[PDB]
Symmetry: C2
Subunit: 151 residues, 2 copies
Amino acid sequence: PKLRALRPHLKIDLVQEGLRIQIIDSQNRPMFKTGSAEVEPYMRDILRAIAPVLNGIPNRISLAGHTDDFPYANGEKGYSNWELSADRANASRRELVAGGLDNGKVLRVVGMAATMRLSDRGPDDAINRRISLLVLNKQAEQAILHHHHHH
Amino acid sequence: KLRALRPHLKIDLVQEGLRIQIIDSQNRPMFKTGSAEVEPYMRDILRAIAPVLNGIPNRISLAGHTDDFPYANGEKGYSNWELSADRANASRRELVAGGLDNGKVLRVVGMAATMRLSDRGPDDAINRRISLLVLNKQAEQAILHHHHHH
């Protein structure tokens, strides 16, 4: 019934590095109030809903935030998309943990700002605001583990 | 600044490029405990390397490492995850203040206490560090390709 409402927000697909779960915004429905890193009610439900499922998968997670709220012609000297994307990723992280997801599964939190946007400013830029959960392969995990021992 | 920063500033070469690490010391932290606002000394170092980094035509990834909060608990609220991300973003804002172009920043990462180098013994100061990674073109494309489906 309400799976029609999840359909334009929950984007699941298989990626080389593993299982990517994207929670994207709509024109009429955002997962976060514009400029805010506070979880919207509907966003709260989705994260607590997939948390018990993800906890059943023996693999670890990487969280990445994407946001288009603040300008990037900004110069980004104060609170920008970098802080916002990182905060929204961590906000999603806290909800997942509250949903029953073991905290030990979290491996990385990433702020992407708007560097990975798909649309320009306009009636389509809702897709630029998304949270990406990446359930990693054992090989992809080993690569990232290795990379951040170099970082 | 002969040996005022050299116990704090480490520079080494890795596969992905040039890694610039800013490490805490036992008696001189780069951030006050639990806080993500930059210390007066941190601000100086960051603005001292910002103009140099701006000269290098390569882009940068920021990463923070923290063990201020207990990872043995549930990490249900504000934890090392938020603190490491905020400290990375705080270092980021001090870099653009030092004249570094914001377009050079490619990624901000919180790693919490995952990449911890030492248990909470005598000198566990190394567990608290900010890592600047100046990426070569190969590593930059990889990270771009990776996050393009992340």
